[PDB]
């Protein structure tokens, strides 16, 4: 038939703002025709890894629903977006399954986010009581407690704030520059 009704992928990859990693943004995709060849063969990408399906196998197969997840992280922490990896971002912020079927994409966004003089728009979570379940999320900002003693509503010796800022600056190191990461999941039921 005459191909029409393409998917809104451009609304995701090209956007005004991107959510923080500990509050990663999620969108559902269904009843549209996607063209993964454009994304794979675009020249503006830096890390393109697919798990479970080859780039042409993406164009071959069809699936029920698609999920798109968006966040922003620093350079050295892009390695953590893969099954069976360790690190604070993976352990306490965002976790992938051990049998993941999808694709992981990351590209540099130095000019877009590293405004002159420093930025404070993005945050990540530093402490938690237990490891994150697959695709589990949390937004509550209760005062983290270490130790047996009860913690009041005031920061102190073993009462800590569970969030921290990224000090992005255009004059930073090679690995501290920002990176935008998109994770695509395909489920067939």
């Amino acid at each position, epitope marked *: 038939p005459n191909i029409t009704n393409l998917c809104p992928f451009g609304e995701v990859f090209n956007a005004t703002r991107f959510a923080s990693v500990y509050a990663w943004n999620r969108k559902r995709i269904s009843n549209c025709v996607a063209d993964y060849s454009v994304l794979y063969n675009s020249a503006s990408f830096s890390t393109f890894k697919c798990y479970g399906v080859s780039p042409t196998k993406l164009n071959d197969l069809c699936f029920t629903n698609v999920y798109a997840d968006s966040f922003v992280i620093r350079g050295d922490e892009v390695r953590q977006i893969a099954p069976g990896q360790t690190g604070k971002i993976a352990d306490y912020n965002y976790k992938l399954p051990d049998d993941f079927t999808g694709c992981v994409i990351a590209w540099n966004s130095n000019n877009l986010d590293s405004k002159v003089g420093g930025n404070y728009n993005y945050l990540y979570r530093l*402490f938690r*009581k237990s490891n994150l379940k697959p695709f589990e999320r949390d937004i509550s900002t209760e005062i983290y407690q*270490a*130790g047996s*003693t009860p*913690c009041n509503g005031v920061e*102190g*010796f*073993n009462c800590y704030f569970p969030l*921290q800022s990224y000090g992005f600056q255009p004059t930073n190191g090679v690995g501290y520059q920002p990176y935008r990461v998109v994770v695509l999941s395909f489920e067939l039921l």
Partner: antibody
Amino acid sequence: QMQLEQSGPEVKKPGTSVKVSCKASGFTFSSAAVQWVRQARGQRLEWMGWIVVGSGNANYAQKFQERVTITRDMSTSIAYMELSSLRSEDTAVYYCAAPHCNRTSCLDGFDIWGQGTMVTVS
Amino acid sequence: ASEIVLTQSPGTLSLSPGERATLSCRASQSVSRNYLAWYQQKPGQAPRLLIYGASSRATGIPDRFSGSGSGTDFTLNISRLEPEDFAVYYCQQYGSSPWTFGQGTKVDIK
């Protein structure tokens, strides 16, 4: 084994600046916190500042606010303190104190104590 | 002005070996979340942690050391002081900035 080992002696001319390190081993240093204490010969003890390792957020006494810089380096697990505008009153011995914590939590008290590094102002 | 100023009651204290003794460390306000601890120091040595929270005993601290306290008033007791137990003592508060020490106290054998 849990230990906190310091660099040792330092001798500086008056009016200069001095720097001290202490190196920590045997515990999850990413969760603990460090406190700096200074002692003069038979002159009790003097608290000056404390830092949280995970964030680097530091707090200083007013008397030592403009003269003391507290820094950490997580990759080598080192604590650094720098004092500027050295005076004759600065001939003393310095201590860094920190607890031991597993990943989950802390002992709610300071028990890992260093050995002490002497700073002399000639 | 300073937030909290501590005070140790006993001065130079002299005791016969094994004689029970008590020290007190009081303050102007109530320390937030009961943060007082005791440290023990010796000449040519670094301090060691004795008791945190005025009640809890640290690893390696014998049964002969005891403490208690609440609000403005805390106390420490030692019944059978061994000759090695005679040293200088200090009490610290770390509830609210800025944390402060006491004036110390010396214990000697009579």
